[PDB]
Amino acid sequence: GSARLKGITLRIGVIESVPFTIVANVINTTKLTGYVLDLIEYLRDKMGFVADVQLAPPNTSYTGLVLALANGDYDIAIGDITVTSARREIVAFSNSISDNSMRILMRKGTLIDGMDDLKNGKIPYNRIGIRIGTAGEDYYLREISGGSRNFYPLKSRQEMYDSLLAGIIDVSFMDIGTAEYVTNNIYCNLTLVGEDFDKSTFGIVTPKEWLYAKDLDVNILSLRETGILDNLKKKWFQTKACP
Amino acid sequence: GSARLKGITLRIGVIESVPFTIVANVINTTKLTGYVLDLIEYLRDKMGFVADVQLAPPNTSYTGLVLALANGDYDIAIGDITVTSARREIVAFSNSISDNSMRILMRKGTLIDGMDDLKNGKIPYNRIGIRIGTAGEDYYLREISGGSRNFYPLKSRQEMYDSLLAGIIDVSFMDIGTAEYVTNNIYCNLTLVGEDFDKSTFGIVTPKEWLYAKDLDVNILSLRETGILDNLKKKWFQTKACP
Numbered sequence: 001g002s003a004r005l006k007g008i009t010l011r012i013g014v015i016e017s018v019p020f021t022i023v024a025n026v027i028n029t030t031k032l033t034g035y036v037l038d039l040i041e042y043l044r045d046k047m048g049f050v051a052d053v054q055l056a057p058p059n060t061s062y063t064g065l066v067l068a069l070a071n072g073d074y075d076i077a078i079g080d081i082t083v084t085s086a087r088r089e090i091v092a093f094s095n096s097i098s099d100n101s102m103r104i105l106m107r108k109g110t111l112i113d114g115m116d117d118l119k120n121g122k123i124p125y126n127r128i129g130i131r132i133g134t135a136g137e138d139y140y141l142r143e144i145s146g147g148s149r150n151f152y153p154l155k156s157r158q159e160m161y162d163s164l165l166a167g168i169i170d171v172s173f174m175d176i177g178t179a180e181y182v183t184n185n186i187y188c189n190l191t192l193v194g195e196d197f198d199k200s201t202f203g204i205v206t207p208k209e210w211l212y213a214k215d216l217d218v219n220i221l222s223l224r225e226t227g228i229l230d231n232l233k234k235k236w237f238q239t240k241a242c243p
Numbered sequence: 244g245s246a247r248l249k250g251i252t253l254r255i256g257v258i259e260s261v262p263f264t265i266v267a268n269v270i271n272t273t274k275l276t277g278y279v280l281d282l283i284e285y286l287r288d289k290m291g292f293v294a295d296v297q298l299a300p301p302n303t304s305y306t307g308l309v310l311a312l313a314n315g316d317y318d319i320a321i322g323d324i325t326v327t328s329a330r331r332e333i334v335a336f337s338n339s340i341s342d343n344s345m346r347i348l349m350r351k352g353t354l355i356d357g358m359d360d361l362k363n364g365k366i367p368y369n370r371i372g373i374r375i376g377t378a379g380e381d382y383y384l385r386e387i388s389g390g391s392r393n394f395y396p397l398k399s400r401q402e403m404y405d406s407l408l409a410g411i412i413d414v415s416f417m418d419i420g421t422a423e424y425v426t427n428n429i430y431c432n433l434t435l436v437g438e439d440f441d442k443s444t445f446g447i448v449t450p451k452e453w454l455y456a457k458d459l460d461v462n463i464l465s466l467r468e469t470g471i472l473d474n475l476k477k478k479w480f481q482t483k484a485c486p
């Protein structure tokens with residue numbers, strides 16, 4: 001059957017990723033803001049659930065978040081979470097909240113023209129940094145290395161940026177939204193190269209055969225139709241600090 | 244509960260729309276080809292269902308196709324079918340098979356800059372053609388006419404083209420993929436104008452709470468990941484016959 005989320009408490013898993021989910025230390029506690037938190041508020045206001053927002057532990061991967069939900073740790077998870085076939089085997093996803101694709105990230109001045117350089121072996125595989133438990137890893141294993149885990153593994157975006165800046169790796173992969181955001185606002189010495197790749201979608205993770213699937217989907221689609229999702233994207237992503 | 248589609252017969256509703264579902268008569272019998280027919284065969288090969296493909300009667304609308312499925316006339320429906328909030332109330336949708344948006348269609352030479360001209364009343368409402376029972380109608384009512392069905396109603400794409408060419412209407416709306424195909428291959432004197440609008444997705448229509456939801460979704464996502472959906476889009480949409 002189906003039912004409405006009105007009155008229900010949802011444990012909502014979120015994962016740090018600026019400007020989707022921004023974690024600020026304050027004194028001492030944490031305050032969450034961002035596209036995701038604003039989305040939650042639009043859904044809460046319309047649907048009437050009580051939002052119990054739970055930030056995933058540091059270094060949790062995207063796959064880890066999904067598995068945690070599947071094991072009953074959260075009721076739903078909201079973020080820049082790519083819909084993939086392996087994930088869909090164990091959880092369901094809402095209608096898409098955003099289109100997505102990936103970009104190559106590198107230091108400015110690095111002699112890389114695009115994905116051909118990665119696939120032709122111009123870069124040593126152990127100098128391609130890949131965050132384990134991400135769709136980027138899925139792409140890498142499918143399209144670059146033929147199943148071999150021969151990349152430089154990364155535990156977080158922060159390790160990615162630090163390793164690029166330190167010259168420990170030469171490239172990595174990011175989703176296009178955050179890729180643009182961080183290269184235009186935080187790391188002025190990092191840049192994007194090549195064509196975008198792996199066109200995909202982000203969706204809200206839910207349990208398989210969830211009682212509340214229809215309620216959530218109708219509401220997401222209504223936010224899409226009425227321009228709210230576009231408004232939130234502009235609010236959080238249309239900024240550029242770097243000169 | 245859940246089940247696999249192997250060995251199961253699916254009645255698959257399709258709807259004429261070149262080059263998604265292309266309908267020919269031959270000598271008397273009907274032949275179907277296109278992106279949709281190829282997609283069905285990719286899914287059949289991997290999932291092992293028995294395909295019973297059924298073409299919707301002439302002048303069936305997109306809303307009509309969805310309602311026919313909800314009434315039990317089909318098991319699934321595959322085509323250039325937009326996922327909307329109103330439809331999700333009565334049916335479910337698979338994982339997206341394609342991103343989508345709409346374009347303004349017009350005769351070459353018509354002095355329309357973009358959607359603002361329609362919203363400002365540059366065009367008399369009876370010269371804006373809208374196919375009833377489509378997402379274009381939904382958009383018109385929400386964003387242009389404040390709920391007033393004051394447009395020139397159309398029963399099919401053919402009536403849309405004929406009406407534009409005869410000078411009975413000045414503009415209509417199409418999905419981007421087919422809009423490009425038709426103006427680049429069939430009607431060389433029609434053209435597209437303005438920014439894209441109503442970003443959306445296409446999905447396979449299924450019953451709500453369907454037993455086979457996961458099997459279908461995992462397989463669509465696998466076709467995405469392995470590049471088959473990209474290959475199919477290239478095969479059917481890359482052509483440009485017009486000079």
Ligand code: MET
Pocket residue numbers: 062063080081082083102133134135136137173174175
């Ligand atoms: C470029 S990989 C970034 C994370 C990705 N959106 C995921 O869900 O795995």
Ligand code: MET
Pocket residue numbers: 305306323324325326345376377378379380416417418
């Ligand atoms: C521009 S409306 C074209 C039909 C649309 N894809 C629908 O499902 O209603």
Ligand SMILES: [Cl-]
Pocket residue numbers: 094095096326338339444446
């Ligand atoms: Cl969707």
Ligand SMILES: [Cl-]
Pocket residue numbers: 173174175178179
């Ligand atoms: Cl990323």
Ligand SMILES: [Cl-]
Pocket residue numbers: 091092207208209456457
């Ligand atoms: Cl499911």
Ligand SMILES: [Cl-]
Pocket residue numbers: 083095096201203338339
């Ligand atoms: Cl999707």
Ligand SMILES: [Cl-]
Pocket residue numbers: 356357358359436437438
């Ligand atoms: Cl416009």
Ligand SMILES: [Cl-]
Pocket residue numbers: 416417418421422
């Ligand atoms: Cl169309």
Ligand SMILES: [Cl-]
Pocket residue numbers: 002213214334335451452
């Ligand atoms: Cl449902």
